């Protein structure tokens, strides 16, 4: 029933509130505590309404500013969730201001607080899925560009190829590095990291195979097909490493049912 926090960022933001809810429940099992009046919660609830309203606007701005259709589809249901839970909190504060000892008002308080927790988790998760999709798009870009190696036959096209690829790789590596730090499972971290390391080591090897090929074509020594094949093998081993990374990232997410 209680939501699962998948990344370290999400855990840091939500875990403490989840703990606070449990503390309140446990506190209420003690005889000295249950029976006591819940103080006036009008103002503290007004603060929550204000923060919910801010979160919904920021989310709506995030929905109207993105190309991510999956995001545009998933966020709204989460807005409905937190708003509904917020409504319960507002109701409970009303009930508790006339009857500070209501047991059903206290239940509304806990249910509203739990609902906000899970609605916020869902929202943070959706936003996290989308960030991961951005990383996957970059990897997929690099994967596509790796096949451009097949149309490179001149030394000039090679220099262009190298100019364009190097920075794409550097950017992929940074994103993977950032991502590995969000993960809660070491299994995935080392997979991602070792794969990225292998692709980085293969780059100069690919660029060298492409050069040998161009040179051979020019100089004409007859060994052109060996050169092509070797270049293709390199592209092939790099492409498999990247596909592995894409797959681990997809495994590291897709998490919620939504989309």
């Amino acid at each position: 029933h209680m939501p699962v926090f998948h990344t370290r960022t999400i855990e840091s933001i939500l875990e403490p509130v989840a703990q606070q809810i449990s503390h309140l429940v446990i506190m209420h099992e003690e005889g000295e505590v249950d029976g006591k009046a819940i103080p006036d919660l009008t103002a503290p609830v007004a603060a929550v309404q204000a923060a919910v309203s801010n979160l919904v606007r920021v989310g709506k701005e995030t929905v109207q500013t993105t190309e991510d259709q999956i995001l545009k589809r998933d966020m709204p249901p989460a807005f409905i969730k937190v708003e509904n839970a917020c409504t319960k909190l507002v109701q409970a504060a009303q009930m508790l201001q006339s009857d500070p000892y209501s047991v059903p008002a206290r239940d509304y308080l806990i249910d509203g607080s739990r609902g906000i927790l899970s609605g916020t988790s869902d929202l943070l998760l959706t936003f996290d899925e989308a960030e991961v999709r951005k990383i996957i798009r970059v990897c997929k870009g690099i994967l596509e560009y790796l096949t451009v190696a097949e149309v490179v036959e001149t030394m000039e096209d090679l220099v262009t190829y190298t100019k364009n690829l190097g920075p794409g790789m550097t950017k992929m590596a940074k994103m993977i590095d950032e991502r590995q730090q969000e993960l809660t499972h070491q299994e995935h971290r080392v997979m991602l990291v070792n794969s990225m390391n292998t692709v980085k080591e293969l780059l100069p090897v690919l660029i060298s195979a492409m050069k040998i090929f161009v040179t051979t074509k020019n100089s004409k020594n007859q060994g052109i097909e060996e050169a092509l094949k070797n270049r293709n093998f390199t592209v092939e081993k790099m492409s498999a490493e990247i596909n592995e990374i894409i797959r681990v990232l997809q495994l590291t997410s897709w998490d919620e049912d939504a989309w």
């Binding site: 960022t9 933001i13 939500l14 403490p16 509130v17 606070q20 809810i21 503390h23 309140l24 506190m27 000295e32 505590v33 006591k36 009046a37 819940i38 103080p39 919660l41 503290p44 609830v45 603060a47 929550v48 204000a50 923060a51 919910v52 801010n54 979160l55 920021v58 989310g59 995030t62 937190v82 909190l89 308080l109 607080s113 906000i116 927790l117 916020t120 929202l123 943070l124 936003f127």
Partner: peptide, 25 residues
Amino acid sequence: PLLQAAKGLAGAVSELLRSAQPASA
């Protein structure tokens, strides 16, 4: 930004739960 907005909501809910504790206990 979204992350800061969620931190603010988590903050408001924590303060609310803390205020719900009896005066005093």
